[PDB]
Design a protein around this ligand. Structure first.
Ligand SMILES: [Mg+2]
Ligand SMILES: [Mg+2]
Ligand SMILES: [Mg+2]
Ligand SMILES: [Mg+2]
Ligand SMILES: [Mg+2]
Ligand SMILES: [Mg+2]
Ligand SMILES: [Mg+2]
Ligand SMILES: [Mg+2]
Ligand SMILES: [Mg+2]
Ligand SMILES: [Mg+2]
Ligand SMILES: [Mg+2]
Ligand SMILES: [Mg+2]
Ligand SMILES: [Mg+2]
Ligand SMILES: [Mg+2]
Ligand SMILES: [Mg+2]
Ligand SMILES: [Mg+2]
Ligand SMILES: [Mg+2]
Ligand SMILES: [Mg+2]
Ligand SMILES: [Mg+2]
Ligand SMILES: [Mg+2]
Ligand SMILES: [Mg+2]
Ligand SMILES: [Mg+2]
Ligand SMILES: [Mg+2]
Ligand SMILES: [Mg+2]
Ligand SMILES: [Mg+2]
Ligand SMILES: [Mg+2]
Ligand SMILES: [Mg+2]
Ligand SMILES: [Mg+2]
Ligand SMILES: [Mg+2]
Ligand SMILES: [Mg+2]
Ligand SMILES: [Mg+2]
Ligand SMILES: [Mg+2]
Ligand SMILES: [Mg+2]
Ligand SMILES: [Mg+2]
Ligand SMILES: [Mg+2]
Ligand SMILES: [Mg+2]
Ligand SMILES: [Mg+2]
Ligand SMILES: [Mg+2]
Ligand SMILES: [Mg+2]
Ligand SMILES: [Mg+2]
Ligand SMILES: [Mg+2]
Ligand SMILES: [Mg+2]
Ligand SMILES: [Mg+2]
Lengths: 179, 78, 126, 136
RNA sequence: UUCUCCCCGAAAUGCAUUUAGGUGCAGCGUUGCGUGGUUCUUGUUGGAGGUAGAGCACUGGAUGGUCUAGGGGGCUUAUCGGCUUACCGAAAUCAGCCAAACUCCGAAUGCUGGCAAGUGUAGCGUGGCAGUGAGACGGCGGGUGAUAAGCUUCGUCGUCGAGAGGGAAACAGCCCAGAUCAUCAGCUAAGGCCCCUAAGUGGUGACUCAGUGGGAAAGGAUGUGGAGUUGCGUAGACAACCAGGAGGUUGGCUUGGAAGCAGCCAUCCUUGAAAGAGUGCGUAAUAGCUCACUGGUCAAGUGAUUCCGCGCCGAUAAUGUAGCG
RNA sequence: GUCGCCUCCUAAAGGGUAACGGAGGCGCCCAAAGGUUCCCUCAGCCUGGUUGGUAAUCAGGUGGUGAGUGUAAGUGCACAA
RNA sequence: GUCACUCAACGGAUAAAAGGUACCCCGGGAUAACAGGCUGAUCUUGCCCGAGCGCUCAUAGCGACGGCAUGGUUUGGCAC
RNA sequence: UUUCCGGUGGCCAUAGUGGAAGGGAAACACCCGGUCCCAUUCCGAACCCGGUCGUUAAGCCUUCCAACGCUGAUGGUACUGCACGAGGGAUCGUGUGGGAGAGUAAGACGCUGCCGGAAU
């Protein structure tokens, strides 16, 4: 899915300008790529928060003078206590292309009550295609107990989403309870 | 009561650069007092017994790099 | 091409010669008044150049490679002495008078010493 | 009680308690956690009380991570004594907490009882803290 | 320690001291003579750095995971060798961390040169005469101390000291502002404009109803306004009101009793438009009262949840209201 | 308890900066451990090897400073100091 | 030129020196004891959380581990 | 003049580390000897001397590989000079100037001077 965001040129730089923008309830963003100079824009705060609710969404930035262009939020600086987005790094993508992204690991398996599944990572770097971004990568540990551990080289990854990270380290662990 | 096993300290030695970059100096003028060669002697600069870098000639002091060393040179005055 | 560090994977003899050359060069440095005579003593030839280390250029040079000396029958030491005489003559021509000798990581002995004494006889002040 | 095996210097200056959390502002091991919204000093006794509360409420399941460590020693002037005669003897071990620091983490427990355990733990801490999760 | 006025105007620091409330030298004052932009401010241009921050390359500290040398416990039973290693576990490695005496990094300022402009008359040399060498509080950056003191000890700027005038109810150190004298003129600073008390019971838009304003914490609370996110809802929501609110099943370790209510659990199946081995009240122990869910007259919005503004509780000493003067 | 000297931190990236603040050293030593010239590269780790073991001496491989520096600490020093 | 000082209280009062005074005598609140003032560690009085104890039953009544404050009467700190 | 190569500097990893392929005309090198100068805290290993047969296996050289390492913006954030402001208090915020580190896109399998060589 494509999320459309209206942005306009940002020209004032520095902490004072950023504070003024955030008080105006916008959010600064820098959009860069492998073909053109970085573009400094400001986005609507509410729209940016709604768009960034999900992880790795495909955004289209529209500037009135310019043309819509496709980007991904690569680094989102959010406030720590409040959830507000403080700054956005947008990385331009060339429609038909390939990208490296992080997809969230979750556990959807059940074992004996003695052992509890644990995730060794929050995100895994997975090389996928633009139009099919895996929302979540799911691994199921059902009927497996004791001290079995799962590394990154054995996953039921969806089609077109190759693994870019190392496959010689553990990802999921099941072990007896916190004794 | 109690007491401290500390309270001793040595007198201030007043090290550091004495003539900065571009400053005009005379021959023999001390450029930097130091312990060890944080700055090595460059062109027109001699190194003394206590690692003091001083001017071997008149000119302007510059700080630079000679091969892999931080050095202090005295460029002869134009 | 100089890199401070001795290139790794270099042969053991080459590393030893490079280290000795560097430690000699630590105090040897050629100026316009007293340029640096560098003698590279290869297994078959000796190549001598007088260098102004300030500018990084060679003023005069000589070697056994010269056609006037290739067929000059003689031992390695004799050929090195002939090279030393030639380089001294060229230094006199260029008006060098005094030089500083850089053995370039080799012992001052044999061919190197013969070349140095030949230059001294030719009239170089060192 | 968490006490370091050894420290380089037993008598140290008071830790800076200015600024936001330098690092460790995000969950790294567990699913839920406690995030301090205010700075302050966190002693090993308080850490142990909170950990006991969480573990006791979650019973046997789930696992708890203590992200912070009370490795900073605090000296105490000898009692009833006039000022001076050198620094005191270490008496407390604290961790330097800054706003946004994740103190405790929990995993392997349903969200509601995890929240209740975190509430029990937070009521033992000397600074304000909140329950956080990986957005569920 | 006794008359006057005119000009300038400190110090309470450093070093040393049989010294610490003394004194010498230097610092700071004044003054004669001499030297004249050398001082200073700003801009520009160039230097050395390791603080703040940050980081984990080093040295220490540290959490979890993987893995493991090697130690512990056992047996077959041991000289081995094996099963174990379901225990311990250096190291290595992955991820998150910590540091006044850690640094792969690294500012702002400050310091110090060149140049340019601006500038009071600043700077410097050398003589005469000093006083001072008990400091105080405030801002900022630190040590001591308990996250203490109107505490103590440094760095730095300010005021006071040695400073009147305006403001702060009063109130050396805070804010405004440096008093040559006269004036029954005007404009302002901080702070103020209902009355005390000079000037607005000013205009417009919101919020508060606590006399909050006009002291306070952890914590607690259908206070009240505003901004979201989200579930359900004229397939008819939430309340209110009439019928089904139970079989098998007194489910099991308990406990003369756990039958639905001592505590702990697999957290099922059924006559069926409907229901939980079961949530409150009742109860020696079962009974029962009553709810989610099952229809209907009515039905237009409800139910969560987050954040923001102002409020509430917590709140609590002694002569007299007495924490807006 | 302290008094002179040296190193670090406090000390706020020049210098300087106090407390009965936090850590340690000094009142020597060396005729070479001084001068000069030339030569050399360590510690650790891995493998093999009489006595011999974690570790003596030897071999190969790896390894740039983590060894070393008469003596504290810092600044230095592998170009080696 | 060089020598002789733990003149170490190390800018080194004499080459040469310990005590008692409640029998005592002759500036300082620059500095202690008492009271006042500040502070509140300690003390004191509350409060939040509720492990647990209370046949059963957290909260009849109790309150572990921790947390937050009141009072200024305790011991102190400060030395106004 | 150009190309290739040997020496000798400069920048001191954008150059290193590791992997792959290929090359020697001069040159470099390994290599072959130890009689001679000389040498080993033993050893002609090294140093030195005498040769240039043999050999491109290695050094060296050329091409390729971002793989480890290295280099690295823009924007934002931390901090901060000056000027203020807010909390009972730890402490926090704003104006006006300066502004990182980390991380991100990316760069990069070196650059450059002089001398000599063989060919053109
Ligand atoms: Mg010397
Ligand atoms: Mg000396
Ligand atoms: Mg990090
Ligand atoms: Mg005056
Ligand atoms: Mg810091
Ligand atoms: Mg004086
Ligand atoms: Mg005095
Ligand atoms: Mg004084
Ligand atoms: Mg004083
Ligand atoms: Mg003072
Ligand atoms: Mg002050
Ligand atoms: Mg302090
Ligand atoms: Mg005071
Ligand atoms: Mg006075
Ligand atoms: Mg004044
Ligand atoms: Mg006044
Ligand atoms: Mg007044
Ligand atoms: Mg008044
Ligand atoms: Mg007026
Ligand atoms: Mg005004
Ligand atoms: Mg009045
Ligand atoms: Mg009105
Ligand atoms: Mg009005
Ligand atoms: Mg009230
Ligand atoms: Mg009130
Ligand atoms: Mg309140
Ligand atoms: Mg008033
Ligand atoms: Mg300093
Ligand atoms: Mg400073
Ligand atoms: Mg002082
Ligand atoms: Mg003295
Ligand atoms: Mg005497
Ligand atoms: Mg008597
Ligand atoms: Mg008297
Ligand atoms: Mg007094
Ligand atoms: Mg007094
Ligand atoms: Mg008193
Ligand atoms: Mg009184
Ligand atoms: Mg008292
Ligand atoms: Mg006192
Ligand atoms: Mg005082
Ligand atoms: Mg970078
Ligand atoms: Mg950067």
């Amino acid at each position: 899915d494509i999320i459309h965001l209206k942005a306009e040129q940002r020209t004032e730089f520095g902490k004072g300008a950023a504070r003024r923008i955030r008080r105006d309830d916008k959010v600064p963003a820098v959009m860069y790529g492998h073909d053109h100079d970085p573009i400094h824009v400001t986005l609507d705060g509410h729209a940016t928060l709604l768009a960034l609710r999900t992880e790795n969404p495909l955004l289209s930035i529209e500037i009135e003078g310019q043309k819509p262009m496709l980007a991904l939020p690569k680094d989102v600086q959010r406030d720590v206590l409040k959830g507000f987005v403080r700054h956005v790094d947008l990385l331009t993508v060339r429609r038909g292309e390939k990208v490296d992204v992080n997809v969230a690991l979750r556990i959807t398996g059940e074992s004996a009550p003695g052992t509890i599944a644990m995730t060794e990572f929050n995100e895994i770097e997975v090389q996928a295609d633009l139009l099919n971004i895996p929302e979540v990568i799911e691994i199921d540990v059902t009927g497996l107990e004791a001290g079995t551990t799962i590394y990154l080289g054995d996953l039921k990854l969806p089609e077109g989403t190759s693994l870019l990270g190392d496959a010689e380290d553990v990802a999921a662990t099941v072990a007896f309870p916190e004794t | 009561a109690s007491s401290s096993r500390n309270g001793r300290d040595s007198n201030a030695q007043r090290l550091g650069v004495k003539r900065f970059g571009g400053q005009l100096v005379n021959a023999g003028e001390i450029i930097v007092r130091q312990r060890g060669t944080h700055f090595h002697p460059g062109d027109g600069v001699g190194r003394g017994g206590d690692d003091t870098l001083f001017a071997l000639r008149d000119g302007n002091v510059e700080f630079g790099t000679r091969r892999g060393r931080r050095v202090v040179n005295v460029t002869p005055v134009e | 091409a100089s890199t401070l560090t001795v290139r790794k994977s270099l042969s053991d003899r080459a590393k030893a010669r490079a280290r000795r050359q560097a430690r000699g060069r630590k105090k040897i440095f050629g100026t316009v008044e007293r340029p640096r005579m560098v003698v590279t003593r290869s297994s078959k030839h000796v190549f001598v150049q007088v260098i102004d280390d300030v500018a990084g250029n060679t003023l005069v040079s000589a070697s056994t490679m010269e056609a006037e000396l290739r067929e000059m029958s003689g031992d390695k030491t004799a050929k090195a002495a002939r090279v030393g005489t030639i380089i001294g003559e060229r230094a006199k021509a260029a008006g060098i008078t005094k030089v500083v000798f850089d053995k370039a990581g080799n012992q001052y002995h044999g061919r190197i010493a013969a070349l140095a004494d030949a230059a001294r006889e030719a009239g170089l002040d060192f | 009680m968490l006490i370091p095996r050894r420290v380089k210097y037993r008598k140290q200056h008071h830790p800076k308690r200015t600024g936001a959390a330098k690092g460790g502002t995000q969950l790294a091991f567990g699913d839920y956690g406690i995030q301090a919204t205010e700075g302050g000093y966190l002693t090993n006794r308080q850490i142990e009380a909170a950990r006991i509360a969480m573990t006791r409420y979650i019973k046997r399941g789930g696992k708890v991570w203590i992200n912070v460590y009370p490795d900073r020693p605090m000296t105490k002037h000898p009692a009833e004594s006039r000022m001076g005669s050198g620094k005191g003897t270490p008496e407390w071990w604290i961790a330097n907490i800054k706003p946004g620091r994740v103190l405790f983490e929990l995993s392997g427990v349903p969200e509601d009882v995890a929240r209740e355990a975190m509430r029990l733990a937070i009521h033992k801490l000397p600074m304000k803290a909140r329950f956080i999760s990986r957005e569920g």
